[model samples]
Target: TFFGQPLGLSTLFMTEMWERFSYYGMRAILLYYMWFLISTGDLHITRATAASIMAIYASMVYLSGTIGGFVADRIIGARPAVFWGGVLIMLGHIVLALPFGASALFGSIILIIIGTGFLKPNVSTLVGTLYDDRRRDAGFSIFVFGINLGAFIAPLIVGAAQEAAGYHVAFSLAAIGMFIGLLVYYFGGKKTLDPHYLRPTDPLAPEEVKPLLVKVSLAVAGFIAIIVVMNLVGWNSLPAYINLLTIVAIAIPVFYFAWMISTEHLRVVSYIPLFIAAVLFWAIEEQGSVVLATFAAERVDSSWFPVSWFQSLNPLFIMLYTPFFAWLWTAWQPSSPTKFAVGLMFAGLSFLLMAIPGALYGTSGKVSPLWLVGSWALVILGEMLISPVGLSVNSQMMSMWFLSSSVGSALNAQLVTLYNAKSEVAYFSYFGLGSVVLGIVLVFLSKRIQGLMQGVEAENLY
Candidate 1:
């Protein structure tokens, strides 16, 4: 009954579908909007300035998930958090739909960032909770399909609408999509919600969870204060400050883990190689936002193919290739997580493909769209192999008591944002070059890291 007759799965699927549609749809146009604003000399920013702002906007959208995950786990629970998130997302879209101006643009971006933080993690967590552990993996695979499905279609639809009507019209359509998702959750209610949904049992008690709440609140308030001061002194300094803070946040846990591993036995060390491999894998995979977008906008031929339209390629390939890869993995029965290594190799190949167009066009603003397509396709193949597996391995290897969803979300956001901060043309070259170097480093160090993991396991260091 659970496997064959899953009723809630369909609803959850569609809800996620619309949510992703709203997300990717906006993302599809964002870089182009930044370009348009700068190129037309309509905005007071340069191309580099626009790129930095866009990077921050994108970073905030994902980074906010850390805060959202905390609120969901400690205060609101997943359902309420998701519902409120959807509303904010809808409102953000509405803000975007208004006539173009500095106020509208910045306001919409802020709303989207806040709303996405609230929505993305909780909704995904709820989807996982829908089934028991055995079925959870399959359910998530199905849910991920919805994400790709919306992403695949949204670009064509939203891109065309934006091209024909204006950016405002396209955003309004995305707003409508978000509203539909909110409506679904509202009608479905708590009874039909995911069974294992994360929620605090009581409203409040010192024993229940006071320390965590206090620590998190203090951390957020401190960070916000720092940011405000930076903005007051010089708005441009905020990103650097934020980057420094993120580095500190990431380092504390990493150092703690390293300390634990040093004292531990050997068998558990196998996981460190996997974790390092995963980081390298993600670093390469993240070029889609930084390098690929730049290549499409500046290098690729956009007279026939809009830059936003190119954003569709990854999702389209995911929908096309996921099943095929799943079958291949099942049949091949790879002896090790060598699939991760293979994926990294393909990701490297994608960059090489990118280098072809980049070299040919030489930032001339007109290269074959085919190059973007080829690179995007290869990267998607790599993504299909590495991303899901990495998440699974992390869950399996780490202790549940210490694993906070917020940390996971933050790590993912950090990797992408780090890449995003680089120059578009330089972004791909850096990734390609970095990957080649990291790939060689991994070969030499894998055995040593594996040895370190022997006795140690990840506890709630976060």
Candidate 2:
């Protein structure tokens, strides 16, 4: 079925499948839970604030992966790092499942943030160790399928549960999903990846302890000082805390790119343009969790499912669209970087499709659920071109450090701020048109970059 990829392939599949199940399942209703004024939700935060939080949360998820990947690269080896991550994820969900109020929400947030950091990128890295490049794309496509499959079903189940029992039930399911993911991963590692890639690649040496310790201490102090400064003024408004997170979001990635570029690794350098182009692609497509989620909840006529279920459309389409790409890449593997540019063009086209409906209907109007799915389907077209290539590239480049910060953090949720006010049209038009134009530019630059990628990953640098 997966073309003899690996027996361990199944293990990675199930592990990632359920991890996504937990992640997307919880995401299905989390925004609403945060902002709801109904008796079911007492939080009563503003929509903008909720959107801001969700945006920051999504950004942190990517940023935190840097920490997780660094830990795997340096300390506990990928296997232990992944296990710890899974454990934290489960505990985080458990906290959410219990109705202890906003304190519980904050607790779950911290746990899941740290947990996902460890789990997400490390597991994907292990998949690369299982096979060489010829079959790696195929393996990664399989991995992508698992993630989206989990994503597709999560919202349906959890969304329905949210309808019936409110948010906690859905969160409980998320935790349970993580538990199964752990079980599968434990067995899978034994059978598939651990023997090959279990040990840390760059564990700290005993001789270097004091230098590392000093750096780590200074870093910790810096984080504490900044947190104090950010919080000193207040935290009751949308811009208050969200602005700080967004600031760090930009700063962290900026520094990481600089770090990688300074190393003068041409392999890393090859990915820079692709990375720049990819930023908007992710920014536009990722709206499913932020602006799109808000739109579905506020305006769309979702008669049968919660607005969160609409979020499932991204994954559902991925499942439907992936096989064709798997076939195409197998049939004739084009320049991988070229495909990335093509994918961005498709991403731009998707937003334009989305823009049309809203442009005609007005932001306030309600429309068919399928209409929204149609626009998402266009993005899937773009996704098919970019996603597997992106994943495959990440695996190839995992040997290079600085991956999470360079590629994974390429997404910019802060761009969603453009979606508000009279400037709403700019959100749809600029990102939409921006991707298409940049994608074309990428298309022209593709072979040159591909030459640089003689080795491969903007996988644009995730």
Candidate 3:
């Protein structure tokens, strides 16, 4: 078939590629678009609000994956779920392409969040179903390349589209990209993908259905009642809503880890230090699109290119470095715990590097573009070290990975309030050193962590 993989890989690859293209492409311009509207008096939100909203949106998107997983297991099959999700995503982009302002922004967010919840995890799940353990790793690696490939070029194309036209037209292009993806998946998937995906893998028994439906109905009513009460009490502000989301984001992992640790397994102890390191690492890495993008737009001299184009650097560096890491690991592999520790060090350094530009140039002046470029280059090196090591191992760690991202995004929601020209140096310096310190501490504990792993995923350790 295709490259010794199933032909369905091609269909799934293109589907995910265009999905990433639309997602990242929209994110590239979304901040600037919101700020533009604010400056023109077309929107009433503050810059901090915009930043917080960006963080919360990302946080919620990840959180929604649980919902998607449940539905795919018990209700609609992954095939129908993905198609419906794609349709919703396309419609979300279409809504954003309209000129309806703040309402459009919020509405599109709801649609895209729910859609991505349904689409993202299931596609990866389908990929697993395609290959046995022997080939699954390589298949996912190829799939990840498709993901980065789409993300790498999206800002390049979408930014230029925004520069030539306006935000709406750029958003329209994102919609078109998704539309094309749906076409490929629809036709190609029919012939190539497993028809087994047409039915739920683990459907609920008839005896269990009635009780579940009752519980769901009651939960919906209770949720609506709380919303009504909150609205009536004048607690309907954006910040209030953000606070609610923040609590939920932070709560999920706390409860999840608690439930996980309560079970009998010494190996679970291994995830403790590594999870902390991963969470700290993600806080720095995920900032590329949020904090770093803001720095690029406001502080860097982007006269030569659109600020949104800076978004491409994250994925671009990933693509450039992934192959080298793959080759290097084949020759000399390190312990996963050690890799996580070192990755945090690099992530910290990336942020530390940003502080220099701020300290030297101040907020009033622009800094060299290389500052941002160097930061991404360093951070991606960290990504290469940790991402494959952790992700390739098992799904237990995968949940930990996504939780780390969720917590990091929730942290960003609060952290961005401290971001501005005056606080630039201190902002970078504080977060940088905090991460660096955690990294140093992790290095000391790496041996202990490896021991706790109990030989699970410890084969690479020297």
Per-candidate local distance difference test: 0.65, 0.72, 0.82
lDDT value for model 1: 0.65
Name the weakest run of 10 consecutive residues (lDDT summed) in model 1.
Answer: 393-402
Candidate 1: lDDT of 445?
68
Taking the tens digit of each residue's C-alpha lDDT, what string does model 1 give over 287-352? 465456766766655776456888888888887787787777667554245655666667777877
Query: Looking at model 2, which ten-residue stretch has the lowest summed lDDT?
Result: 399-408
Order the candidates by TM-score, highest first: 3, 2, 1
| TM-score, predicted candidate 2 vs. hidden true structure | 0.84
The total of clashing pairs for model 2 equals: 3
Measured on C-alpha atoms, candidate 3 has an lDDT of 0.82
- Write one digit per residue (lDDT tens) for candidate 3, span 46-118: 8998888888888787767656766886899989888888888899999989977877988899999989888
Report RMSD for candidate 2.
Answer: 5.1
Model 3 segments beyond 4 Å from truth? 210-229, 262-265, 389-395, 443-446, 449-462
Off by over 4 Å in 1: 1-5, 40-42, 132-135, 189-191, 194-205, 228-276, 333-337, 360-365, 389-427, 451-462
Worst 10 residues of 3 by lDDT: 389-398
State how far residue 352 of model 3 sits from its true place (Å). 0.1
Count of residue pairs whose backbone atoms collide, per candidate: 10, 3, 0
